[PDB]
């Protein structure tokens, strides 16, 4: 079982580096599940939250190492459950386009969201889960 774990680690390092994995030679021929990465986004249409006392939820189909957000209004956020043990995390519309993640691989999913006190609605756009 020790050498089995060694083989598993070798396969994991292979999938990570994508150097010893010769699957790329066939992946480049045409798209498949292996070439095509899975991720999440939203359509062109901005997503709206004109309401409060209302913690919008968003269920990614995958864990996400990083994110990317664009808006036109100040809002709140929490990647933990905002109601039970969740830290607030607020937005300034000036610094609306941004990201977090990457090297700091966060094991997040099922994000939450909500409007904050402003003078309009919070149309949002999002790009997530390069994982």
């Amino acid at each position: 079982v020790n050498v089995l774990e060694s083989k598993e680690f070798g396969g994991t390092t292979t999938v990570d580096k994508d150097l010893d994995v010769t699957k790329n030679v066939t992946r480049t021929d045409e798209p498949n599940e292996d070439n095509t990465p899975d991720y999440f986004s939203t359509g062109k249409d901005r997503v709206l939250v004109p309401d409060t006392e209302e913690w919008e939820r968003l269920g990614f189909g995958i864990v996400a190492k990083t994110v990317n957000v664009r808006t036109t209004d100040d809002v709140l956020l929490a990647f933990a459950n905002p109601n039970t043990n969740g830290p607030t995390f607020k937005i300034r519309s000036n610094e609306s386009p941004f990201t977090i993640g990457g090297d700091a691989g966060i094991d997040t999913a099922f994000m939450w969201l909500k409007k904050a006190e402003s003078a309009q609605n919070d149309p949002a756009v999002e790009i997530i889960a390069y994982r």
Binding site: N83, T84, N85, P87, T88
Partner: protein, 174 residues
């Protein structure tokens, strides 16, 4: 001579103390805490499953506010941040019958569960006045948490952090 005592000490909290804090409140502003308890340094405190409260919350004119008023005790970590995981005593106001409920075993309103408070952790007393009512004042009001003088009631248990070896464990608990 004086008799030795344990680190554990049985007490009863209230308004006129240094580390506690308060403020006035207006109607229709439940998010404003009228009381802000605040962990002293090197002093853990503790509350078992059931302990009295004397939620005396009267008007400027010395009158208990509307019975539709509500009280929510609530734990808070640092960052001035409320918390849902950990909350005590969601109840109304016009229910307690102040004059006797500070005394009798029966009126006596105990907590929902236990609690612990490290050297700096906050607790807040949110007060949902419905709207259009009379405002709140504190000087014409009080508040308590324990029954330490008596023989049937419970009391708050304080300990000095230096007198323990599980302090790191409770710090991990938070």
């Amino acid at each position: 001579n004086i008799g030795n005592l344990s680190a554990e000490k049985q007490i009863s909290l209230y308004d006129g103390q240094p580390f506690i804090s308060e403020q006035d409140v207006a109607a229709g502003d439940p998010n404003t805490p009228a009381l802000t308890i605040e962990g002293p340094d090197g002093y853990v405190i503790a509350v078992d499953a059931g302990t009295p409260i004397a939620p005396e919350f009267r008007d400027s004119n010395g009158e208990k506010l509307d019975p539709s008023t509500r009280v929510i005790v609530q734990k808070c970590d640092r960052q001035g941040n409320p918390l849902g995981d950990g909350i005590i005593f969601n109840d109304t106001l016009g229910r307690f019958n102040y004059n006797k409920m500070r005394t009798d075993p029966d009126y006596m309103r105990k907590t929902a569960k236990s609690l612990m408070v490290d050297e700096r952790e906050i607790v807040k007393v949110f007060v949902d006045v419905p709207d259009g009512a009379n405002g709140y004042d504190a000087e014409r009001s009080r508040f308590t948490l324990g029954d330490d003088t008596s023989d049937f009631g419970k009391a708050v248990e304080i300990v000095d952090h230096d007198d323990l070896t599980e302090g790191e464990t409770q710090a991990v608990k938070s």
